[PDB]
């Protein structure tokens, strides 16, 4: 006589409710972290948004590869329960320590004098690459905030999700997980903006962004502990299926040719192609957008309030479009839904670049909407990222996870951990490498925006050419 509250069994409810509530808390922290990490490195003194091309390739990329190897080594020395804590607790300690301890000490540990000497000896083109050494502690926060979205959002959660959840519940409640975790963006974006509004209490003296950063990093710990408490509960009071595997345990002792196995497949060879094409294109657009952001919001608090507003808008757009996807998929197909994201990103990016390039003459409409050309660029790039990233979260990520179904059950576990951890940073680092070569070749990033559009078309025209290759092979493992 098991009850079926809301038509859903009360035994599965004890498994799904704390799981979507966890993914709510996980994306609540990431919304604070991924917003603060941009406020931290872009609006610092002596740094610009041109640090981002160099942050992602030389700092964020090898630390993601370094974490992959450490997490893979940690997977075969700790239990599944212990592996979750030993990955997520150091994140909680770091962000809590950064708010309360490491950020106030930044003025003591940041070599602002040695970097200003490098800036003169090496010139204006190198403000970006030198800025990594100025605010290296803020650059470490950047990679840790980047690793939260790649490990906690993707590896830690979905690894625990796909373990306790059956295939039938994963087809019914996973779409609800994204819906409830975009309410997290709406609420954490309001949280980022609320705690970014300068108190104006004690206008002189105490840093306004310091009290802002301490309040938010306190929530990151509190909402991060909620992830650990929601994890302790499902593992103690919810029956774990321990579903029987089909393969032997003999696949082991692989640390270097696991990558060779993962690249031998012409299937993962196109999954990774899509996961890099997105990330290359998104970087190519968003680094320029964030340069416009720094030009428009120079103080950390203005930038953080705008990032909170932008996070709320991203949450609402992604909620709407995750509601629309569950009709787009059924009506059209995987191949059309895999075309929507590259096309929307390409069109939004070319519209943004054709406003940075060919909008100066078309200033009449910019003034008509009561804006400056820079504010118009800021809002157009904000819409670019909102549309592209909501499109991702609602069709590309569903298309990605709807392609791992016809595989082995051990290739997928360490394959879409690999794909995430070293293909999202890999794609964004490829885009960042393009942008940083163009920075060191043409001086500023503003001189490089005509060539950003040509490269954007090349990556997208292969993004579609690789989705069709995966489509013609996602269709051929079906009737």
């Amino acid at each position, epitope marked *: 006589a098991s009850p079926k509250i809301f038509g859903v069994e009360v035994a599965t409810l004890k498994k799904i409710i704390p799981l979507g509530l966890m993914f709510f808390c996980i994306l609540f922290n990431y919304t604070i972290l991924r917003d603060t990490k941009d406020v931290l490195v872009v609006t610092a003194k002596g740094s610009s948004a041109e640090i981002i091309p160099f942050l992602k390739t030389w700092v964020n990329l090898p630390m993601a590869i370094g974490f992959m190897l450490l997490y893979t080594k940690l997977s075969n020395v700790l239990s599944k329960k212990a592996l979750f804590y030993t990955v997520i607790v150091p994140f909680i300690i770091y962000f809590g320590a950064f708010g309360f301890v490491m950020y106030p000490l930044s003025n003591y540990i940041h070599p602002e004098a040695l970097a200003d000497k490098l*800036l*003169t000896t090496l010139g*204006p*083109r190198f*403000m970006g690459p030198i800025a990594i050494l100025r605010i290296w502690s803020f650059c470490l926060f950047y990679v840790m905030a980047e690793l939260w979205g790649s490990v906690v959002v993707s590896v830690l959660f979905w690894g625990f999700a796909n373990q306790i959840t059956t295939v039938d519940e994963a087809k019914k409640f996973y779409p609800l997980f994204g819906l409830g975790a975009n309410v997290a963006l709406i609420f954490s974006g309001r949280t980022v903006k609320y705690f970014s509004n300068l108190r104006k209490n004690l206008g002189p003296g105490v840093d306004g962004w310091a009290v802002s950063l301490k309040a938010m990093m306190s929530i990151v710990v509190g909402m991060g502990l909620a992830i650990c408490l929601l994890y302790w509960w499902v593992n103690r009071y919810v029956p774990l299926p321990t579903r029987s595997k089909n393969k032997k345990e003999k696949p082991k002792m692989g640390t270097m040719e696991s990558l060779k196995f993962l690249v031998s497949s012409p299937y993962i060879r196109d999954l990774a192609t899509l996961v890099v094409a997105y990330g290359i294109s998104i970087n190519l657009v968003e680094v320029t957008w964030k340069s416009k952001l720094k*030009a428009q919001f120079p103080s950390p608090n203005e930038y953080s309030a705008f990032m909170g507003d932008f996070s709320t808008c991203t949450g609402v757009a992604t909620f709407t479009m995750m509601l629309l996807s569950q009709y787009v998929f059924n009506k059209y197909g995987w191949g059309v839904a895999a075309k929507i994201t590259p096309t929307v990103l390409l069109l939004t990016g070319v519209a943004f670049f054709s406003l940075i390039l060919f909008g100066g003459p078309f200033a009449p409409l910019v003034a008509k909407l009561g804006m400056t050309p820079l504010l118009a660029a800021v809002y157009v790039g904000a819409l670019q990222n909102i549309f592209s990233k909501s499109a991702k979260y609602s069709l590309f990520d569903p298309c990605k996870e709807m392609a791992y179904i016809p595989l082995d059950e051990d290739t997928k576990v360490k394959g879409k951990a690999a794909i995430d951890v070293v293909c999202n940073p890999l794609g964004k680092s490829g885009g960042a490498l393009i942008q940083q070569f163009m920075i060191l070749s043409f001086g500023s990033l*503003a001189n490089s925006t005509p060539y950003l559009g040509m490269i954007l078309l090349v990556i997208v025209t292969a993004w579609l050419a690789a989705a069709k290759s995966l489509e013609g092979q996602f269709n051929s493992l079906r009737s």
Partner: nanobody, 120 residues
Framework: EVQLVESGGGLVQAGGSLRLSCAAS????????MTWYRQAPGKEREWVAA???????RYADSVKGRFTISRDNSKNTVYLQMNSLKPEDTAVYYC??????????????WGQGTQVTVSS
């Protein structure tokens, strides 16, 4: 076609204030690395202040805290606000747009300078 014209220099008492103006033509000042130099008769040209396209400001130790370099994008002008002027600040101040990589100077455009004199 790049030109820099300086203005605002003049006589002030010790401890007074001035605002040197740099009207630039042929390039946007927000995309440029702008600097203020000063040269007094009998001494070599001395770098005073610098502003970057990112808005980052750098100052010499002798003027740090008293001088402030900024720019107006709409006017395409670079300003040097000189407060608490000492008699040792008397020099011809040059505004300069510049670009270089390590020691290869891609372009280097100067102004004709403006005289700043601090009385005693």
């Amino acid at each position: 076609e790049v030109q820099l014209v300086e203005s605002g220099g003049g006589l002030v008492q010790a401890g007074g204030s001035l605002r040197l103006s740099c009207a630039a033509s042929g390039f946007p000042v927000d995309e440029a690395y702008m600097t203020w130099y000063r040269q007094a008769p009998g001494k070599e040209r001395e770098w005073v202040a610098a502003i970057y396209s990112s808005g980052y400001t750098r100052y010499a130790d002798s003027v740090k805290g008293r001088f402030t370099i900024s720019r107006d994008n709409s006017k395409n002008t670079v300003y040097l606000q000189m407060n608490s002027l000492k008699p040792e600040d008397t020099a011809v101040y040059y505004c300069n747009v510049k670009d270089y990589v390590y020691n290869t100077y891609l372009y280097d455009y100067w102004g004709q300078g403006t005289q700043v004199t601090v009385s005693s």
